[PDB]
Amino acid sequence: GNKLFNIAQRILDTNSVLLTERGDHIVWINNSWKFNSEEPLITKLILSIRHQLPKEYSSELLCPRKRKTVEANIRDMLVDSVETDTYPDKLPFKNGVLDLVDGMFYSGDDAKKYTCTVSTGFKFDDTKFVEDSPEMEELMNIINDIQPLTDENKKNRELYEKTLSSCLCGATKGCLTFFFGETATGKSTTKRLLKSAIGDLFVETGQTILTDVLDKGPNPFIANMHLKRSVFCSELPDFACSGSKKIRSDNIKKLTEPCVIGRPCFSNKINNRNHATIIIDTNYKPVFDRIDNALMRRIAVVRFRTHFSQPSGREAAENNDAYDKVKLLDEGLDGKIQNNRYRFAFLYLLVKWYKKYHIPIMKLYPTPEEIPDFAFYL
Amino acid sequence: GNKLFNIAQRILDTNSVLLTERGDHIVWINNSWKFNSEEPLITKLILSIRHQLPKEYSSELLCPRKRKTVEANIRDMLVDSVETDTYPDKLPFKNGVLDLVDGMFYSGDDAKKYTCTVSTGFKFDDTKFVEDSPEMEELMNIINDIQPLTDENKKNRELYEKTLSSCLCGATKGCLTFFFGETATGKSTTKRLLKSAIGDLFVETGQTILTDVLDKGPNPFIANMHLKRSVFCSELPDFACSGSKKIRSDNIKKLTEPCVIGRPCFSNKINNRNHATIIIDTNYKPVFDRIDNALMRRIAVVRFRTHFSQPSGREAAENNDAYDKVKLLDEGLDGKIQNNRYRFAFLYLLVKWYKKYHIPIMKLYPTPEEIPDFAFYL
Amino acid sequence: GNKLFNIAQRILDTNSVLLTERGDHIVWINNSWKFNSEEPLITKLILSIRHQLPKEYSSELLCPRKRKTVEANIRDMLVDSVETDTYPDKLPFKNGVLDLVDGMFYSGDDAKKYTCTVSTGFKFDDTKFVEDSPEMEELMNIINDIQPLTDENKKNRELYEKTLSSCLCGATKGCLTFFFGETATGKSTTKRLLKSAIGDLFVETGQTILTDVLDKGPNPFIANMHLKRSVFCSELPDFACSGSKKIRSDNIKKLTEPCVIGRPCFSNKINNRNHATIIIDTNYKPVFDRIDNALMRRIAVVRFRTHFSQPSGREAAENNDAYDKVKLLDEGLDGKIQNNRYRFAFLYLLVKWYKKYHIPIMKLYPTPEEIPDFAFYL
Amino acid sequence: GNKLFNIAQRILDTNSVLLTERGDHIVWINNSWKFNSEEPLITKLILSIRHQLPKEYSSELLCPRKRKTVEANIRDMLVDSVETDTYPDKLPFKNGVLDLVDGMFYSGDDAKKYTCTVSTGFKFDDTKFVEDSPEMEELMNIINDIQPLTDENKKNRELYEKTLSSCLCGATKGCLTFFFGETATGKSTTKRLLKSAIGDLFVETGQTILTDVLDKGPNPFIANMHLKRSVFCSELPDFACSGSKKIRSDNIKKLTEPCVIGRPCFSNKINNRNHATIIIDTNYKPVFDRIDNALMRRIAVVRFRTHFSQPSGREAAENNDAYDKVKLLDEGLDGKIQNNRYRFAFLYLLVKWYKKYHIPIMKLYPTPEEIPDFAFYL
Amino acid sequence: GNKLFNIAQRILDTNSVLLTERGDHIVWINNSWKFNSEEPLITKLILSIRHQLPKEYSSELLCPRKRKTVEANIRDMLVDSVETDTYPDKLPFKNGVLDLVDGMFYSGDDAKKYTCTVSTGFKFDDTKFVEDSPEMEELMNIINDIQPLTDENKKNRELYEKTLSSCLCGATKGCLTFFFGETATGKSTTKRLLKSAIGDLFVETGQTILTDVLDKGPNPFIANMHLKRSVFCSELPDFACSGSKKIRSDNIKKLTEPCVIGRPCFSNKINNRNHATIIIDTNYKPVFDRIDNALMRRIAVVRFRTHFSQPSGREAAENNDAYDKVKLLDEGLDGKIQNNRYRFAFLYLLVKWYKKYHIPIMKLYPTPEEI
DNA sequence: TTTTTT
Ligand SMILES: Nc1ncnc2c1ncn2[C@@H]1O[C@H](COP(=O)(O)OP(=O)(O)O)[C@@H](O)[C@H]1O
Ligand SMILES: Nc1ncnc2c1ncn2[C@@H]1O[C@H](COP(=O)(O)OP(=O)(O)O)[C@@H](O)[C@H]1O
Ligand SMILES: Nc1ncnc2c1ncn2[C@@H]1O[C@H](COP(=O)(O)OP(=O)(O)O)[C@@H](O)[C@H]1O
């Protein structure tokens, strides 16, 4: 029969082209589910799959006028839509899917069954994803300097590890976190270390979504956190200076449901899946709109008490009560952090903590007995 | 003469392609009506029906350029439009229509007269639609814990059942329902169970449809409520605070009308069909701009008075006067909801309730003796 | 010579295709003038007229690539434009034009003379257009309950009849009517009956047409009421609340003009012909920015006083002065309205009322005494 | 040599297609110059000039694909622009140019010299352009009623005649006339008479051209008033209200230049020729943004005094201050103007007035002493 | 082979098509560097140039699709852009250019090296470009009447001549001129004279260019000054009130730059080359955002002290202090102004003044001794 | 501002 239809049927039998509910046509090229709303990539898959089909078909898929016919046949056989990103314990890279339960790494068809549209952005190095490397020792030194293992810092370190490790789970979390500490403590260092580990599954969204009604008009500060594993918010100002807004309590309750309401510019889609692990990076203790039992259930605080200063104010910083350690400020850190040195070394630590803390079910618990207002209300 | 016109005529005689009043071309593929404003699906239908014509006609539909000719002929033969969704007592799925008055599943031509352009988005498996199941007992235990079967909570339970079961009828409901209660009481669990049950006939919007005006400029928060059978507008703020917009009474009055005025972006269609049951999962007592009988005859309140807590906070919850019974939290409940485990059991429960409350006429009644301001005006 | 040129000239000899001043190519299919700026309509008529040409010509029109050549010729032979909708007292249906003055129904070539570009959207049943019928008997009871035929409600009843019957004549009306009354008095029932009666010549818009500037940017709320014979703008909010926009004084003046300024999206046409009977379904008395004699001559108010109540709250309706009668609510009325039961009985009633007040000349008059502010100014 | 090139050259030899400085392609069909960016005017002309070519060149213009080739050649052959609408004392009609200074109606090729692109839209009849006729008597009575010939209404009647007769000359004016007066006085009747007299050369625009900056993207409210003789911007609101825009003094400077900017949707033509006679039908005297000495020289105001009252409210009008005559209303008058009964009578009256004020030089003079602010500044 | 490619190469070898840095293709048809971003004129140029090619090639350009193929080839072979409008001493017309250093009119290939994309809007006829004419005498009388040719107004007259004549030099200018006077003193008369003389190389703007930042929102008032040789800013309010925005120093310091940063509606090109002599006409004393030494080196002002009133108001205006001579309002003066009879004469005066003042170096010197 | 355009 029509031999340009047999090619389309054979290509479709591989389940390489899929139709999503949002109207996209996700394709499977180079071990990744890529999609582009502006230009479909079906003709890319048709040309890439050329080697699987027999020799009698390969000579015909080179002409673009035949590739267009094959794409037209394919688009008329995808009738139903499927579901995407339904596996929480899977981290999608640019060349496979890392399994978090047993720390495996599947590529090819083995990674095809997990339909994950998002990706980390970079490739996975099985040789660099090891616990025996000088990078791992350097990282373990940096982390222990930021958060020591002293018994005075026992719970605060386990909570920190839990919060950081929950940044790899593709499931909805029902608790915020507050990276609270004085200046020059490691919050922006932890943020940069985490961004170097996940990459594309990370946005440092604006502060405006703590004090603004995210309902009227456009708000791309919300539409960006669609399927993002981690969302970081900084810039908590003083609540006594002019412009002292209040962290809207009802707004905190909105960033806990699996679907957040908000649309981008020139768009009609109003619901965004909430896989984020929102971490508010603050320096001063936050002042809330109004405290109630519904608000105290979805907040955790990770205290930061360690100062990395230059040998000018070291003694003055030591005399201060806001810190507990006065370790020496290093300059090579920001060099080999933005340059992605401790990328896989931090990934191994995150996977280890994820195994230690959330194997059966991923869940974040509040710590309300840390904020003075909450302590008063308790 | 032209056989590509005979094919189009034969396809037209089957009454598989129809023209709607909005200008869409609804096709009939896989026992369900489908449409897409961006790209027509007539070619999909032409290629699909190919298995119902003789051999001399079944081979001509493989070439896309010969399919566009049939599509052009079909578009040129459709003159007069039709009206859709005229049957309120039917629930459409991806593979047929369930008749609620008899609880009978019709597939194929048996369910084609009921031109339902919407669907739940999943198949209907008749093996999970029975009482004899382990999942049904678990769902019964969950619901009887959220709303206990006592005698001080009998009218409330009946109102809750009526409100939940009204989400299957595709008619205009003239009441607004508030899910009022303290934190951790079962409101979001009910919302998620309803979403799993009715599937895609369920849209969650922001609160901007109650505090802003739905007339100026675009408003896809209202344009998305077209032909949807349930709407959730949860997370009401605290109107007792300073700077909280009250609920506009006129906005409440619009939402209980057969047609709601509101347009999407880049669109001129200004009218949308209101088949939705609007439920406001609130946490505080609502406050309105003005109170009058027209507002008092459109509001119903159902209360949640069962707190699900951990053993850690089990003691502070018993002294609270906002609860009637304290149960133990279930950490794994959320996992087997997003997996659609209690999906068809809840569907059977809703159908059973609809068979009991809304058989002759479907109607929702107000409960003015639940808001203190309404009680004063009573 | 050219077969297709002769085919195109023959179609133009039938005077079926026409060009209007607005730039629309109206065609004559199924005894009705139809126009649509996006769908292919000239090819539709070309395919439909096929059973007029001889056999040697009737076979070429089965190829879509040949039906576009004939359309291209027809679009080139049309030089001059014509004027449409110049008869005010003719009501067009989907299969003819009803003459209001005498009641004769023309179908076929006799209806081609009145170039009415709009239509009701359904056929005209001469069998149901009779005075003696069960539905006509129930409708009379419904109306006599909504507006009783007493002696203190005779001027109001005749004003209501005038306003309702004026929705059939396609001429500019220089007055706006307010359906005033407390809740549950029969206004929405009248609106639904009118919508079922006049069909497509009825558009419902928001109150943005009353309090906004209807001139800047796209505005499909004004662009949609082009040639519509009735425009309902319900849901007027309270004005006693500080924060409510008053009804703009000049908008009322602009809406009573033979041509309204406003354009839809993706278009340049800025003039819409005003045939509408604008009816505002309000609950409280309207408040304007400024009151002047230029505005009291453009406003009429008709009151609804019969209250339809449930047996429980019936007693409370006997002490409110806002009612003159307490009828018992019929729960099944809305079922047999959306099903188009009183469609032709109401049409007969509207025609009978029309040829009793508007036969010499159709004109509407204001009632300034029925509004407190105008009463003060007068 | 070529066959489809000689046809294009011959069509050019007839001087039927011309290019303007704005990029328009004006064609000559049916004794009139026409330009339309949407319709295929060049292809219509190619089909219509088919009889003036040799027999062998006539049989090729039947196929649309040959006509498109001829049109493509014609577009390439036109490399130079020509001046259009240079004669200001000529009035175009659907079938020829009428000379205002002399009075002879130039029909056919004799009207080709005066390249008048715009037209009135209706054929000119010399049997109705007569001086004496019952229609003329009725029109003269109506005009004398609207503006009485009394001694006080002498300096105002001639200004009214000047303003009305300036709408025939196709030259840029320098004043903005305000039809100031109370309600039911005659402004709308005068506007309707002028519209029915001058046909297509009349347009009505919104108040954006006065109270908004006309330089934001597309603005068809300005692109529509290109080469139009008269423009109406009626129904001005009150300015001494809690929130209301102003006349934007700077915006009046732009409306007197012959280079008004503003492009229609889907087009690039930004600058439009300004032959318009801006007339604002208002009820309250305008309030500008800033009053300067450059504004009193481009503003004229004519007062309307004669009241048209119903027999009922006639006594209340005889005591009103802003009225000089209480002549009875006429219901059967405003229905006849839309029937173009006084079309040619009003055209003859306008020509008679034109050959009384605008023969040597056409110029509009301002009347600044009428506005209170300018009177105080004097 | 591929005769169409040979046709494209032969057409391109004549430098009839050029590519601009802004991404537009400028063609050369009928003695004019035309361009149209929406509909390209390359096919018109191919059909026109058909005559200079051999008959074997010239017989193929009659088919509209061969022309499109050659156009595609031409657009493919234009890789690098060229610098246009590099000559400041040339005034472009609709059918030629004018050389002010020699006062010579160039037509045809004699004016193709001078790549002048913008034009004036009308053709040139040198027969009416001579002093020997009465309209010459009437216009010279008007000019000496608006600015007396005496010793009490010598420096003012020379600065007025310099500023008005600078409007022909197609280069950047670093001095903003102010026109100071009372009502009915001759500002708008000079404005209409300039608009009639030069035409398209002239844009009239509003007060907005002195009160708002030039890089917010879609603003053509920064983009419309592309290659324009004049900006006559009017509608300046009285600065002795409340709510009337004053003049910003940053605005003035920005307008005196060779390029201006500003993006039009639906466009990304923020750069616009500025060649405009900015003459702001005022009615009262100006006040700026700040007064410092960085500003008085770019601002010049001239005075007008002659007012015109009708013979009815002759004695009513013959007794005023703000003026010194009062003739009668001439209605016929404005008559042959939109008809543009007094167009080439004023052009001749401008050329004469340019030859008198701007031959060696083009430079405007500020006069901070009057404000 | 966005949306509308485009
Ligand atoms: N483990 C460490 N040992 C020594 N120096 C460190 C260590 N971690 C971070 N620093 C240095 O201290 C600084 C900490 O800054 P940081 O606390 O991230 O800023 P912020 O307080 O704004 O978040 C960094 O610039 C880094 O160079
Ligand atoms: N029988 C039960 N029914 C419903 N939820 C239960 C039950 N037992 C434990 N839970 C848990 O209690 C939690 C209640 O939270 P929820 O009521 O959804 O919050 P909200 O106050 O926003 O409605 C849920 O996460 C659920 O997993
Ligand atoms: N003539 C009638 N007889 C019996 N019931 C009626 C009649 N008219 C209306 N009803 C019922 O009473 C209710 C009136 O509500 P509605 O008229 O919509 O309120 P409103 O007038 O405020 O819009 C309707 O639901 C309708 O079913």
Ligand SMILES: Nc1ncnc2c1ncn2[C@@H]1O[C@H](COP(=O)(O)OP(=O)(O)O)[C@@H](O)[C@H]1O
């Ligand atoms: N010459 C006339 N003789 C009698 N009635 C007239 C005359 N001119 C106008 N009318 C009446 O005046 C009415 C129009 O008033 P209109 O001009 O719309 O008021 P406004 O000036 O407030 O717009 C029409 O209904 C018409 O019948």
Ligand SMILES: Nc1ncnc2c1ncn2[C@@H]1O[C@H](COP(=O)(O)OP(=O)(O)O)[C@@H](O)[C@H]1O
């Ligand atoms: N020197 C002059 N020669 C001829 N007419 C003049 C002269 N000065 C002023 N006028 C007259 O004054 C009017 C313009 O005055 P102008 O100073 O431009 O005020 P505005 O700027 O408000 O128009 C013109 O109509 C012109 O006839």
Ligand SMILES: [Mg+2]
């Ligand atoms: Mg919740």
Ligand SMILES: [Mg+2]
């Ligand atoms: Mg109602």
Ligand SMILES: [Mg+2]
């Ligand atoms: Mg009027």
